[PDB]
Design a protein around this ligand. Structure first.
Ligand code: PO5
Lengths: 257, 292
């Protein structure tokens, strides 16, 4: 209650402090957006495999992006970054995180245990122990409180769209989590119920529907081209009755914006 | 790490040892927290560092530095002289004066209000985790079990038994800020009475003690309570006792604030922000304690 407004304002202030450098991928000599897309999708699988929370995934992605923002990494070592980030997120977010051996095991023993632990140590240094990042997932759960009443399909779909954003560094690094979450929530709300970005949320966020358009346009295309995309773990994950099979809902042809 | 002369051991943990130490170059007195390192950096260490880094407040303990080596991991804190528990025993005979109990609660609620405003649950408030100095300051410490929300924090199948909120004991899926207020509630009473309010020796005993004092919760007072995972229909139905018999030395405002802090249903339990404006603090001052 009395803290809800302050927490939003705070995550807003912090999401600027925890954003990666937008054009870091252009300065990474040996990795592409494509490689990262492969990595994040694999993490989605790991997240399903070990039944880890969705917050854990979002955090890991943020650690990976922030890491790469200042550290050149060879392709052969990208996954090592990915693994350790996932380990750290598990340690931060999960109640009982999977043991290191489990994070070793899932890489077909490409890296030893000695390596993963050292990478954890290095990521902690590079991130300067700053692990409590705001995520799309965090902003959605806030925006959900502004539903009248709460609609489970809307929520699962918005979640699905936000999750999809993680995969494609182009364009989504262009947008703050609060913005993506906004675009996601509106799109899901429009798909399921027909309603739009509510008045209450406009006031809270300061974001008008008009200001959400650019991001909304991009997210709409990702939603449309979802079954053609090279990475597919999230779609599979959200076909599940757990998330009301939302990945099978037909996207609207136009957004009437 | 080479600048710190270890002065005297002051704590024992599973993660590692805490020493009082001094900076050989600047003379600053600090609390060093050693953490021994095969599961990598302990999660509690990761949480404590990460969350304290953010929380800069006069009523939260200040993490000064994190010395990060290959083989050892150190947490540098501003030094505080003793915990509240040691002061409570040192007060056992004479008692803590009300002006000072009022000051302590006021400050604690301020630290806590700051935590909650930055999406941080403490989850483990207790006399041992609350640090005092000789100038009347009190600070929240040990953020090892502290947790970030903004995504609701799920409960396990942690907390010290005595200061646990009833919703946890009754098996609630999620934590909330309400659990930190409950804890402070118990600490408040304890400073007033010189005795732990609910000193259970087991989980069910802890629950029953809360019941004998505040009454056994029903659906009228707490909607949903009888549906909660660990609720049992065979629970004895105790009647609510008069707070004038629970906390005698407290005035009407004291009892008022306390009851709202020990409110059953988490949703209606007073928040730290709201408790700060309660009539109880109309004349709050900053008295200094006498420490041995
Ligand atoms: C009961 N008595 C024997 C206690 C003694 O009176 C002695 O208590 C005390 C208590 C505190 C101080 N100073 C101080 N200042 C700032 C920060 C800290 C501090 C930071 N992390 N931890 N973790 C802790 N831990 C709590 C969890 O267990 C591991 C240590 C205990 C203290 C601290 N400590 C000095 C002495």
């Amino acid at each position: 209650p009395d803290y809800h407004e302050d927490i939003h304002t705070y995550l807003r202030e912090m999401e600027v402090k925890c954003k990666p450098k937008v054009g870091y991928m252009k300065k990474q000599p040996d990795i592409t957006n494509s490689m990262r897309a492969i990595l994040v999708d694999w993490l989605v699988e790991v997240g399903e495999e070990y039944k880890l929370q969705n917050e854990t995934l979002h955090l890991a992605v943020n650690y990976i992006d922030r890491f790469l923002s200042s550290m050149s990494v060879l392709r052969g070592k990208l996954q090592l970054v990915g693994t350790a980030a996932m380990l750290l997120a598990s340690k931060f977010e999960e109640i009982y995180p999977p043991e290191v051996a489990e994070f070793v095991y899932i890489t077909d023993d490409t890296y030893t245990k000695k390596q993963v632990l050292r990478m954890e140590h290095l990521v902690l240094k590079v991130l300067t122990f700053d692990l409590a990042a705001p995520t799309v997932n965090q902003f959605l759960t806030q925006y959900f409180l502004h539903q009248q009443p709460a609609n489970c399909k809307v929520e699962s779909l918005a979640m699905f769209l936000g999750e999809l954003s993680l995969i494609d560094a182009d364009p989504y690094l262009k947008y703050l989590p609060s913005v993506i979450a906004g675009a996601a929530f509106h799109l899901a709300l429009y798909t399921v119920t027909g309603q739009s970005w509510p008045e209450s949320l406009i006031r809270k966020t300061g974001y008008t529907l008009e200001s959400l358009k650019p991001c909304l346009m991009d997210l709409h295309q990702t939603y449309l081209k979802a079954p053609q995309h090279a990475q597919q773990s999230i779609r599979e994950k959200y076909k599940n009755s757990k998330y009301h099979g939302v990945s099978l809902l037909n996207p609207p042809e136009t957004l009437n914006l | 790490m080479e600048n710190f002369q270890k002065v005297e051991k002051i704590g024992e943990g599973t993660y590692g040892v805490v020493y009082k130490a001094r900076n050989k170059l600047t003379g600053e007195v600090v609390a060093l927290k050693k953490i021994r390192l095969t599961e990598g950096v302990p999660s509690t260490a990761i949480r404590e560092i990460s969350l304290l880094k953010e929380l800069n407040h006069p009523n939260i303990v200040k993490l000064l530095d994190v010395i990060h080596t290959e083989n050892k991991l150190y947490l540098v804190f501003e030094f505080l002289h003793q915990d509240l528990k040691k002061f409570m025993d040192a007060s056992a005979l004479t008692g803590i004066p009300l002006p000072l109990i009022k000051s302590y609660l006021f400050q604690l609620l301020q630290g806590l209000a700051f935590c909650h405003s930055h999406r941080v649950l403490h989850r483990d408030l207790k006399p041992q985790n609350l640090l005092i100095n000789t100038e009347g300051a009190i600070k929240l410490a040990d953020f090892g079990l502290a947790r970030a929300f903004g995504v609701p924090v799920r409960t396990y199948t942690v907390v010290t038994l005595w200061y646990r909120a009833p919703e946890i004991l009754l098996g609630c899926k999620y934590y909330s800020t309400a659990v930190d207020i409950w804890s402070l509630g118990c600490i408040f009473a304890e400073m007033v009475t010189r005795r732990a309010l609910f000193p259970g020796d087991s989980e069910i005993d802890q629950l029953f003690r809360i019941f004998r004092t505040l009454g056994t919760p029903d659906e009228v007072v707490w909607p949903g309570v009888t549906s909660m995972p660990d609720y049992k229909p065979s629970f004895p139905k105790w009647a609510r006792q008069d707070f004038s018999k629970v906390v005698p030395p407290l005035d009407e405002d004291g009892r008022s604030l306390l009851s709202q802090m020990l409110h059953y249903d988490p949703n209606k339990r007073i928040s730290a922000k709201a408790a700060l404006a309660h009539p109880f603090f109309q004349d709050v001052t900053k008295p200094v304690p006498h420490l041995r």
